[PDB]
Design a protein around this ligand. Structure first.
Ligand code: FAD
Ligand code: NAI
Ligand code: URC
Ligand code: FES
Ligand code: FES
Lengths: 1297, 49, 98, 49
């Protein structure tokens, strides 16, 4: 047959024309309208698309439940399963416990990741109603969250665990009743008796055969060896979606019993090639628990790799055979199968052979020695023998769900009773274009004794045998080489210990006890968290919620998937899809465009270019950007045009058929390129104070250096999205947009169209994150789509794929700084000169303002009497960089702390004392001559240093480092000062509009947009206090240019300050109008006053407005206040580094933050944690790599590694400063969004302390650029291994920009 | 009356907090709003006409 | 608007009140979330009532612009408006009449 | 109003009215209505929230 039949949320689906290219995600959202399931990445990384599958498993004879990525599941793989989405477990009328707990525990901010995390937890509970803490954490290896900093999610869900004034009350959570879960569809149980018949599905381009038997599979593969096997689709889906490969015939063998069986033999365990890795895991775990240790060495090796192998969603469907045959050079399994000589059975029609994985199995890149007509039946994973030891190793950029830089299986067999080597196998991924054996090094060690000579022989052989070209794919050549030796070292030591336990301690020797920690398998203590904040006054009304931890108003709907983001809006029946076509050259003339292939794609409508722009092609904040490229392209990612088609699928296909011919022009890529070409945005910016010459002459010491700071991709979980709806009259258009800047969106659309602003309406209900990346760069999508709507007269929609968004929309500015600091032997700083350079990319955008804010924070917390900072913004052929939470502040302040770190080391004084004695005091002027009033930073410092027990912990750190040779701890406490207000004075304004309807209910709006920061929640708290009515009577629906005009972007942490005042004033106007009615009826309720005013013909509508007073700095006179007030905070962080791998644990972080009298401590603590964790990514994990020709390599979660659940400080404590009202902002609060981010530098400087200790163990003022990744950490821990592994020019994989 | 355009409503539910947007051929947005809100049992502030 | 040219009349009124051409003023629609608690369009009264409403909202805008008008009594409307915006003066107002 | 494009998921409503000046409703039978292709539901007083 050819009907596809499955269930969704208990409802039967019969699809008569299933296309094999249709994913479950697309089917849920577009065909069934169920938009709770989200698109976050399309490549298995983020988990936003997580759903549960149930089926009757014929082989285990029971109903099973597992999670999958809907983004990678072909619907054609889902015949006779039952899908459950977020909508299927609960809704706001009756929330599932999982939904209730994540909402009420403040575990949903932007809400875009909530459904997927809900579904991971839900599936766990369906499998294990009493999970451990460890199991809960493991449920989310495949889920990403950019907003929360993960703590609240884990803390909320800990309430489910067997072994599990406050922010939430677990006692109020309703209990779990598993009898109340959805029935397994009865029809599927009845169908379980029918034999499986082969199925055929035919799409636009692809034919899918679901084979029921081995005979049908082999027959098919003999007659069409081109038939592409698909099991889990976790490779093939990526190949199709991102590498534009098309396999017009697919066969899915997943149903076939012989590919799914598990057989225990005398030599080991045989897994059918279609067995999911989840089943390999459960089977090997059981065998490891019950068999003798001596037999399970290889099994534990496999398990060690599978620990850091994707998450539950991927492992549920990813087959063991799929990994083997894909034959990526960085397969984590193939090195272990090669090292252990695992036995593979291959079959075709009439043939059957058995082979041992060795070097010949992989004859070339992504090749195996299978014949075209052959399939893998099974792999036998062997028992270990007496005297046989195994280790597996993986080092990536992040532990969880990452691509290995190096990965390895290592096996030794000893001649019985001896420590003499009978066999030795060292196999590696990530060191060549295939999985390799060290076949030249290991023969030489046969018959040697396991000793220091063997260790040194093997390392010198590995350094010689495993060479890498300077240009090797993946770069990090020094690190990779170093890892092969370091992994061998760990294996060497581990084998010593294993010989020890075999009673051969006398022959091989004891392990030095300071070496023991080198061999430990990665392990974390359980998490411990503290949140401290201040109770409101006893006397405060229970209806006054200002200062209370009210949950985000949309949390319940975000948990239920009912909250609507832009792409969740139903399409109009006549709606069209747009796809951008972007430059593949950093700098070139466009010589011609051929759309001839695009025109052949079904549903193609048109290709828009600069010629189609009705009015002006000049856009961007400083009017230096094209809407569409005209004559030349100036970055890889520069938008040339836009395809319009019926569907996103046809628009993608048509975009690929737009062929562009270029002639290259000289490209300026790097900051150095830009300096050498005098390529900058405007003139040098400068702040200077005192006498630099005096100060340097007086200094006991002077230290000079440089620091490089890598950029950052926002990774808002919802990408850029616009719907433009033309109204057919008078140029009128309405746009629905994920943007922080409705005003600029409106302006830019209207100028492009040549219509007045009054014709264009921009609406924002909410964003799934913004973080600065939607302050301006959203408009490059909005303008394109508006033009399409204008041209066609039809609604048009575009949501960017993650790869497109990451390429086009730019990021945080990389900075290069050159510093010189003069200081006394006491640690007192007397002179500082810093030259800052940023890489701005190919339009100005906000670059100059970002550099201003960097210069405004080059002091961080420190009084420096003689100081000069300069900044220059580099104009380059890269995507334009823009706002990112911190807006230059973090870069400026890292530089400050970096030279400060060197001051302390040069003086030989404790860093905390050196920072404290340089700290400003109350009443001091900054370098830009602004007075520091209400300076809470010393209180934050004293509180943090005491509550974190910093001094006592320093003693423990020193002790650890004296007792461990190959792991080291570091500990650092860092302060911050962050100036609050836009650097551009007039942007410090906001407005609101309030209506009171005659039922007494209140509809409020203001200029701010909700992006997960709880702005609407705060404005409702504010309005409720101001009007003295419950929050329940006040509602905010959305943000719109036609309710509040001329709004500033939701930016600069200031939006609660600005909109809070506007809201307060609007409310005051309403109260003044109600006064006479309140006087006449002082008891009678709100509703009576309102009705009385109405029937007395009194207006119940008012605007409100605020501007921040007394702002305006001059660079010429170094006078006037840029800022209204400053935020203050301190963080102390502890780390443990692995000196052999570069990995590290974030052991503990303690934060004390001044948020004034918090409007909402639940939201504010969430902003502290979320900002802190983004900073943790900036400084330690997140790295963008570009080709030498300026092409971004890093375009998705596979390569771009944001913090994972497992990344956060194990012990994570946050205190909001008590008794610190800030009376110049709304209800004495302070802004919170950006200031905490820089406090993650505490982790950077803790790492730097740990490296210093490692360097003393095995050059003072060593370099540590940001981010301090495993590469940078490992390379800086110089030792006997790095020595053996250490060319211009010489082009390499990537260039530092 | 024989208005050439007869009575006509489109109601668009937003799936959040009872919110609903109505496009109506009416002289009386206020009573439209009131009457819809009372029938559904939601506040006036959820209903836009 | 039901064919009686109410929006036409309100644009004419606003243009006089503000002293700018009708071309610079637009009305898109009527909505309960821009003006609440409205009487029906009835009793022949709607241009009388809304015209006063419109006139008052326009007077509020004028009062807010007058310092910028005094400092450039010739400079065009567009310069007064942009000056007010960059001086962080509100360019939104309600109006009402009974 | 009716010139506005329909959403891809938009439904259509038709009122059912009395054919009597003054009467008790003794029963309502929707069996024939349920057979019409595309039928979703029949709303009555009991459906009012
Ligand atoms: C988010 C994510 C994380 C990942 N993490 C890791 C990781 O840490 N380490 C790692 O090594 N990999 C990783 N992978 C890669 C991937 O998950 C695995 O390689 C997976 O095992 C592929 O199996 P599949 O059933 O999904 O393969 P499919 O994509 O269906 O097929 C893959 C290839 O194998 C072929 N094939 C499948 N079965 C057979 C058979 N029986 N005979 C012959 N050919 C066959 C297909 O024709 C195809 O070429 C990751 C992938 C994703 C999406
Ligand atoms: N998406 C995810 O999150 C994860 C995916 N995987 C695997 O990662 C793969 C990534 O695929 P691709 O990006 O196409 O990369 P790939 O399969 O080409 O492997 C890239 C790596 O191979 C090595 N390599 C390739 N050529 C080399 C040479 N000439 N010299 C030295 N080393 C060389 C380098 O280690 C390089 O970084 C996926 O197909 C999947 O199998 C594994 C872990 C996580
Ligand atoms: O001074 C600022 N101006 C901005 O426009 C902005 N944007 C942002 O994210 N932070 C800041 N800071
Ligand atoms: S959208 Fe499927 S994992 Fe990200
Ligand atoms: S709340 Fe998790 S990505 Fe936003």
């Amino acid at each position: 047959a050819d009907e596809l039949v499955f269930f969704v949320n208990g409802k039967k689906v019969v699809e008569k024309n299933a296309d094999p290219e249709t994913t479950l995600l697309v089917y849920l959202r577009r065909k069934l309208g169920l938009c709770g399931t989200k698109l976050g990445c399309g490549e298995g990384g983020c988990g936003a698309c997580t759903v549960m599958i149930s089926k009757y498993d014929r082989l285990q004879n029971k109903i099973v439940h597992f999670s999958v990525n809907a983004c990678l599941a072909p619907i054609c793989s889902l015949h006779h399963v039952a899908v459950t989405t977020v909508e299927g477990i609960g809704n706001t009328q009756k929330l599932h416990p999982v939904q209730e707990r994540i909402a009420r525990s403040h575990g949903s901010q932007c809400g875009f990741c909530t459904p997927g995390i809900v579904m991971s937890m839900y599936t766990l509970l369906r499998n294990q109603p009493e999970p451990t803490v460890e199991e809960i954490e493991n449920a989310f290896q495949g889920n990403l969250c950019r907003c929360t900093g993960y703590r609240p999610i884990l803390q909320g869900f800990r309430t489910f665990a067997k072994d599990g004034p406050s922010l939430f009350n677990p006692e109020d959570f309703k209990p779990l009743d598993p009898t109340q879960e959805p029935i397994f569809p009865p029809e599927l149980l009845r169908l379980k008796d029918t034999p499986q018949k082969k199925l055929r599905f035919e799409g636009e381009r692809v034919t899918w055969i679901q084979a029921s038997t081995m005979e049908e599979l082999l027959d098919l593969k003999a007659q069409h060896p081109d038939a592409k096997l698909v099991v889990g689709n976790t490779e093939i889906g990526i190949e199709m979606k991102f590498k534009n490969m098309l396999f017009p015939l697919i066969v899915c063998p997943a149903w076939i019993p012989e590919l799914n069986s598990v057989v225990h033999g005398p030599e080991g365990i045989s897994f059918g090639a279609s067995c999911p890795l989840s089943l390999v895991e459960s089977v090997l775990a059981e065998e490891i628990a019950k068999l003798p240790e001596q037999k399970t060495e290889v099994f534990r090796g496999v398990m060690e790799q599978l620990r850091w192998f994707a998450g539950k969603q991927v492992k549920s469907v990813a087959s063991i055979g799929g990994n083997i045959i894909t034959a990526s050079p960085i397969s984590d399994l193939n090195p272990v199968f090669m090292a252990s000589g695992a036995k593979l059975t291959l079959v075709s029609r009439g043939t059957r052979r058995t082979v041992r994985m060795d070097h010949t199995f992989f004859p070339g890149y992504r090749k195996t020695l299978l014949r075209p007509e052959e399939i893998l039946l099974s792999i036998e994973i062997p028992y270990s023998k007496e005297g046989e030891f195994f280790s597996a190793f993986k080092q990536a950029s992040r532990r969880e769900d990452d691509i290995a830089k190096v990965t390895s299986g290592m096996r030794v067999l000893f001649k019985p009773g001896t420590i003499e080597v009978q066999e030795l196998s060292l196999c590696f991924g990530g060191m060549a274009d295939r999985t390799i054996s060290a076949l030249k090094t290991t023969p030489k060690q046969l018959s040697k004794s396991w000793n220091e000579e063997l260790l040194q022989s093997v390392c010198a052989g590995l350094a010689e045998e495993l060479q890498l070209a300077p240009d090797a794919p993946g770069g990090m050549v020094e690190f990779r080489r170093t890892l092969t030796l370091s992994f061998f070292f760990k294996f060497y030591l581990t084998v010593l210990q294993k010989l020890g336990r075999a009673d051969l301690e006398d022959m091989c020797g004891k392990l030095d006890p300071t070496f023991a920690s080198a061999t430990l398998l990665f392990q974390k203590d359980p998490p411990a968290n503290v949140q401290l904040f201040q109770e409101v006054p006893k006397d405060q009304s229970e209806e006054d919620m200002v200062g209370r931890p009210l949950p985000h108003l949309a949390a319940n709907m975000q948990a239920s998937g009912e909250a609507v983001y832009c792409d969740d809006i139903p399409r109009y029946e006549n709606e069209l899809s747009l796809r951008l076509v972007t430059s593949t050259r950093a700098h070139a003339k466009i010589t011609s465009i051929d759309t001839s292939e695009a025109k052949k794609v079904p549903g193609f409508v048109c290709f828009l270019t600069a010629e189609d722009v009705p009015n002006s092609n000049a856009t961007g904040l400083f009017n230096d950007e094209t809407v569409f490229a005209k004559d030349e392209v100036t970055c890889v990612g520069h938008i040339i045009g836009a395809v319009v088609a019926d569907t996103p699928e046809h628009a993608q296909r048509a975009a690929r058929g737009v062929k562009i011919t270029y002639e290259d022009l000289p490209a300026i890529i790097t900051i150095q390129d830009a300096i050498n070409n005098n390529s900058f945005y405007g003139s040098e910016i400068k702040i200077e104070k005192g006498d630099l010459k005096k100060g340097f002459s007086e200094a006991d010491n002077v230290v000079s250096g440089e620091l490089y700071i890598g950029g950052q991709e926002h990774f808002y979980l919802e990408t850029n999205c616009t719907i433009a709806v033309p109204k057919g009259e008078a140029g009128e258009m309405e746009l629905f947009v994920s943007t922080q800047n409705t005003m600029k969106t409106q302006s830019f659309v209207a100028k492009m169209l040549g219509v007045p602003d009054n014709r264009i309406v921009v609406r924002v209900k909410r964003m799934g994150g913004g973080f600065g990346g939607k302050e301006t760069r959203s408009t490059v999508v909005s303008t394109a789509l508006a033009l399409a709507a204008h041209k066609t007269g039809r609604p048009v929609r575009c949501m960017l794929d993650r790869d497109e968004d990451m390429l086009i929309t730019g990021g945080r500015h990389p900075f290069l700084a050159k510093y010189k600091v003069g200081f006394m032997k006491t640690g007192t700083v007397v002179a500082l000169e810093v030259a800052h350079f940023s890489n701005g990319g190919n339009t100005e955008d906000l670059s100059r303002s970002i550099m201003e804010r960097a210069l405004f924070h080059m002091d961080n917390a420190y009084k420096i009497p003689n100081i000069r900072g300069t900044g220059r913004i580099c104009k380059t052929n890269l995507p334009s960089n823009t706002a990112f939470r911190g807006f230059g502040g973090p870069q400026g302040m890292l530089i400050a702390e970096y030279w400060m770190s060197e001051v302390a080391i040069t003086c030989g004084l404790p860093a905390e004392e050196v920072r404290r004695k340089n700290m400003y005091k109350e009443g001091d002027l900054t370098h830009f001559n602004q007075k520091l009033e209400g300076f809470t930073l010393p209180r934050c410092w004293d509180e943090c240093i005491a509550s974190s027990q910093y001094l006592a912990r320093k003693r423990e750190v020193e002790k650890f480092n004296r007792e461990n040779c190959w792991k080291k701890r570091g500990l650092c406490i860092i302060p911050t000062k962050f100036g609050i207000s836009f650097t551009l004075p007039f942007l410090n304004q906001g407005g609101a509009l309030v209506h009171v309807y005659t039922d007494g209910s209140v509809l409020l709006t203001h200029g701010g947009t909700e992006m997960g920061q709880g702005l609407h929640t705060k404005m409702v708290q504010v309005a409720s206090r101001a009007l003295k009515i419950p929050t329940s009577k006040i509602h905010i629906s959305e943000t719109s240019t036609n309710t509040v005009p001329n709004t500033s972007p939701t930016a600069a942490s200031a939006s609660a300050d600005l909109n809070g005042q506007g809201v307060y004033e609007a409310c005051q106007t309403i109260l003044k109008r109600l006064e006479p009615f309140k006087k006449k009826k002082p008891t009678g309720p709100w509703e009576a006053w309102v009705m009385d005013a109405y029937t007395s013909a009194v207006s119940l509508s008012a605007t409100g407005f605020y501007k921040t007073p007394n702002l305006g700095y001059s660079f010429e006179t170094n006078s006037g206040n840029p800022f209204h007030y400053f935020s203050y905070g301190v963080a102390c962080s502890e780390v443990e580094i692995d000196c052999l791998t570069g990995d590290h644990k974030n052991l503990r972080t303690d934060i004390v933050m001044d948020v004034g009298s918090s409007l909402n401590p639940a939201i504010d603590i969430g902003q502290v944690e979320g900002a802190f964790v983004q900073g943790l990514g900036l400084f330690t994990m997140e790295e963008l790599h570009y080709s030498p020709e300026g092409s971004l390599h890093t375009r998705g979660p596979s390569t771009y590694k944001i913090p994972a659940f497992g990344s956060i400080p194990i012990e994570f404590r946050v205190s909001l400063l008590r008794d610190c009202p800030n009376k110049r902002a709304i209800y004495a609060s302070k802004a919170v969004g950006e200031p905490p981010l820089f406090l993650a530098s505490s982790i950077f400087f803790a790492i730097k302390d740990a490296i210093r200790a490692a360097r003393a163990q095995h050059k003072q003022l060593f370099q540590l650029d940001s981010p301090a990744t495993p590469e940078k950490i490992r390379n800086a821990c110089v030792d006997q291994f790095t020595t053996l592994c250490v060319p211009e020019n010489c082009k390499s994989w990537s260039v530092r920009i």
